[PDB]
Design a protein around this motif. Structure first.
Motif, PDB file in Angstrom:
ATOM      1  N   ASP A 130       0.853  -1.180   0.000  1.00  0.00           N
ATOM      2  CA  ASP A 130       0.000   0.000   0.000  1.00  0.00           C
ATOM      3  C   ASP A 130       0.903   1.250   0.000  1.00  0.00           C
ATOM      4  N   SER A 131       0.324   2.448   0.014  1.00  0.00           N
ATOM      5  CA  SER A 131       1.136   3.675   0.088  1.00  0.00           C
ATOM      6  C   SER A 131       1.942   3.727   1.382  1.00  0.00           C
ATOM      7  N   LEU A 132       3.057   4.447   1.342  1.00  0.00           N
ATOM      8  CA  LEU A 132       3.871   4.630   2.528  1.00  0.00           C
ATOM      9  C   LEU A 132       3.020   5.243   3.636  1.00  0.00           C
ATOM     10  N   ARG A 133       2.234   6.249   3.275  1.00  0.00           N
ATOM     11  CA  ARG A 133       1.355   6.914   4.224  1.00  0.00           C
ATOM     12  C   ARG A 133       0.422   5.921   4.903  1.00  0.00           C
ATOM     13  N   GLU A 134      -0.208   5.067   4.107  1.00  0.00           N
ATOM     14  CA  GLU A 134      -1.147   4.099   4.655  1.00  0.00           C
ATOM     15  C   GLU A 134      -0.450   3.067   5.554  1.00  0.00           C
ATOM     16  N   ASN A 135       0.823   2.805   5.275  1.00  0.00           N
ATOM     17  CA  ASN A 135       1.608   1.894   6.097  1.00  0.00           C
ATOM     18  C   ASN A 135       1.873   2.451   7.491  1.00  0.00           C
ATOM     19  N   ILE A 136       1.837   3.770   7.586  1.00  0.00           N
ATOM     20  CA  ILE A 136       2.061   4.441   8.853  1.00  0.00           C
ATOM     21  C   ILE A 136       0.737   4.659   9.556  1.00  0.00           C
ATOM     22  N   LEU A 137      -0.228   5.223   8.827  1.00  0.00           N
ATOM     23  CA  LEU A 137      -1.549   5.524   9.376  1.00  0.00           C
ATOM     24  C   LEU A 137      -2.219   4.281   9.934  1.00  0.00           C
ATOM     25  N   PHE A 138      -2.113   3.189   9.180  1.00  0.00           N
ATOM     26  CA  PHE A 138      -2.588   1.878   9.601  1.00  0.00           C
ATOM     27  C   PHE A 138      -3.957   1.893  10.278  1.00  0.00           C
ATOM     28  N   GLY A 139      -4.986   2.264   9.527  1.00  0.00           N
ATOM     29  CA  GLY A 139      -6.327   2.322  10.079  1.00  0.00           C
ATOM     30  C   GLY A 139      -6.671   3.681  10.665  1.00  0.00           C
ATOM     31  N   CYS A 140      -5.776   4.226  11.489  1.00  0.00           N
ATOM     32  CA  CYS A 140      -6.009   5.518  12.132  1.00  0.00           C
ATOM     33  C   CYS A 140      -6.220   6.620  11.087  1.00  0.00           C
ATOM     34  N   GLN A 141      -6.900   7.694  11.479  1.00  0.00           N
ATOM     35  CA  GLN A 141      -7.081   8.831  10.584  1.00  0.00           C
ATOM     36  C   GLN A 141      -5.868   9.754  10.645  1.00  0.00           C
ATOM     37  N   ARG A 179       4.980   3.691  12.002  1.00  0.00           N
ATOM     38  CA  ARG A 179       3.651   3.095  12.207  1.00  0.00           C
ATOM     39  C   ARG A 179       3.350   2.896  13.707  1.00  0.00           C
ATOM     40  N   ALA A 180       4.329   2.391  14.454  1.00  0.00           N
ATOM     41  CA  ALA A 180       4.137   2.151  15.883  1.00  0.00           C
ATOM     42  C   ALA A 180       4.002   3.470  16.627  1.00  0.00           C
ATOM     43  N   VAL A 181       4.885   4.418  16.324  1.00  0.00           N
ATOM     44  CA  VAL A 181       4.848   5.693  17.021  1.00  0.00           C
ATOM     45  C   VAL A 181       3.503   6.350  16.752  1.00  0.00           C
ATOM     46  N   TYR A 182       3.030   6.275  15.511  1.00  0.00           N
ATOM     47  CA  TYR A 182       1.757   6.931  15.184  1.00  0.00           C
ATOM     48  C   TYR A 182       0.573   6.306  15.924  1.00  0.00           C
ATOM     49  N   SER A 183       0.633   5.008  16.212  1.00  0.00           N
ATOM     50  CA  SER A 183      -0.458   4.369  16.967  1.00  0.00           C
ATOM     51  C   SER A 183      -0.564   4.936  18.391  1.00  0.00           C
ATOM     52  N   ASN A 184       0.513   5.572  18.861  1.00  0.00           N
ATOM     53  CA  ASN A 184       0.546   6.208  20.181  1.00  0.00           C
ATOM     54  C   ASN A 184       0.152   5.261  21.309  1.00  0.00           C
ATOM     55  N   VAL A 243       9.793   3.129   8.439  1.00  0.00           N
ATOM     56  CA  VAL A 243       8.351   3.103   8.205  1.00  0.00           C
ATOM     57  C   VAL A 243       7.647   2.328   9.310  1.00  0.00           C
ATOM     58  N   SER A 244       8.188   1.159   9.635  1.00  0.00           N
ATOM     59  CA  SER A 244       7.620   0.332  10.708  1.00  0.00           C
ATOM     60  C   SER A 244       7.622   1.023  12.088  1.00  0.00           C
ATOM     61  N   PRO A 254      -0.580  18.239  13.634  1.00  0.00           N
ATOM     62  CA  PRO A 254       0.771  17.972  13.132  1.00  0.00           C
ATOM     63  C   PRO A 254       1.398  16.689  13.654  1.00  0.00           C
ATOM     64  N   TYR A 255       0.603  15.791  14.233  1.00  0.00           N
ATOM     65  CA  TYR A 255       1.175  14.579  14.800  1.00  0.00           C
ATOM     66  C   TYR A 255       1.827  13.729  13.722  1.00  0.00           C
ATOM     67  N   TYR A 256       1.158  13.604  12.575  1.00  0.00           N
ATOM     68  CA  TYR A 256       1.687  12.807  11.465  1.00  0.00           C
ATOM     69  C   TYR A 256       3.064  13.305  11.026  1.00  0.00           C
ATOM     70  N   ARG A 257       3.176  14.590  10.723  1.00  0.00           N
ATOM     71  CA  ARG A 257       4.456  15.082  10.225  1.00  0.00           C
ATOM     72  C   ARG A 257       5.522  15.076  11.319  1.00  0.00           C
ATOM     73  N   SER A 258       5.103  15.210  12.575  1.00  0.00           N
ATOM     74  CA  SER A 258       6.038  15.076  13.688  1.00  0.00           C
ATOM     75  C   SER A 258       6.627  13.680  13.690  1.00  0.00           C
ATOM     76  N   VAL A 259       5.784  12.678  13.449  1.00  0.00           N
ATOM     77  CA  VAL A 259       6.276  11.304  13.436  1.00  0.00           C
ATOM     78  C   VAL A 259       7.211  11.082  12.251  1.00  0.00           C
ATOM     79  N   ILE A 260       6.823  11.616  11.089  1.00  0.00           N
ATOM     80  CA  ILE A 260       7.623  11.480   9.867  1.00  0.00           C
ATOM     81  C   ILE A 260       9.027  12.042  10.096  1.00  0.00           C
TER      82      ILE A 260
END
Length: 231
Positions: free
Chosen positions: A80-91, A140-145, A136-137, A95-101
């Motif tokens: 899937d997209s890199l973004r979707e690999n990180i978001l992983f279900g979550c919306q 994904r974990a960091v973004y799940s918080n 990326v992995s 700025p949390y997303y770009r902070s994680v990136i």
């Protein structure tokens, strides 16, 4: 309070097989940064699996307070997209997303992908390196918080300079995860002085537990390991 409590716990991978972890007892304070070290085959990776309930508990008590994220050595990627690999279900949330990136050091990766984080990765997509896959992995974990992070040598394929930055920005005392429980399985000595407690394993048992300075002065199992086996 303790986020992880394990008492006299024994685990096997299969009921037919001899247990791999024997009489494990330890408690981890909520918010602690913990390293788990020892020779290859000492049971340190299996310890994480046991906490994820991926082995058979034979005896003992395991209590886990909070949600758990896992960051394995063998980073994996969904087609899937890199973004979707990180978001992983979550919306997506800024700025949390770009902070994680940024913290997972993905910016230089995005900058050379055909469509930034919209790029399809995996089979069917762009070929990412092992280090890219780990970033990326981890993202994904960091973004799940989650409340508890279990890391299994999660940056072994990452450039050493970048890994330093990632540890400082994400995992360490001043990282995004500084208030989480973090358990870091590693064979490297590099960041040991920064963790709160070190758990030394051998033969599927805990040899000793203490801070880096305490264990180093004791001149026992940890000291040997640092001297002879650690990378």
């Amino acid at each position: 309070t303790n986020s992880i409590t394990v008492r006299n716990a024994t685990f096997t991978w299969a009921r037919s097989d001899p247990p791999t972890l024997n009489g494990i007892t330890f408690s981890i304070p909520e918010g602690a940064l913990v390293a788990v070290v020892g020779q290859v085959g000492c049971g340190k990776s299996s310890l994480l699996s046991a906490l994820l309930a991926e082995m058979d508990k034979v005896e003992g008590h395991v209590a886990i307070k909070g949600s758990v994220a896992y960051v394995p050595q063998q980073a994996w990627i969904q087609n899937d997209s890199l973004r979707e690999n990180i978001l992983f279900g979550c919306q997506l949330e800024e700025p949390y997303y770009r902070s994680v990136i940024q913290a997972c050091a993905l910016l230089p990766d995005l900058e050379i992908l055909p469509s930034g984080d919209r790029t399809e990765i995996g089979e069917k997509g762009v070929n990412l390196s092992g280090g890219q896959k780990q970033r990326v992995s981890l993202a994904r974990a960091v973004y799940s918080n989650a409340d508890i992070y279990l890391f299994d040598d999660p940056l072994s394929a990452v450039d050493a300079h970048v890994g330093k930055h990632i540890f400082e920005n994400v995992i360490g005392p001043k990282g995004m995860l500084k208030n989480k429980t973090r358990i870091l399985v590693t064979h490297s000595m590099s960041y040991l002085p920064q963790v709160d407690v070190i758990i030394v394993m051998s033969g599927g048992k805990i040899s000793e537990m203490g801070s880096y300075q305490e264990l180093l002065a004791r001149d026992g199992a940890f000291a040997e390991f640092l001297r002879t086996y650690a990378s």
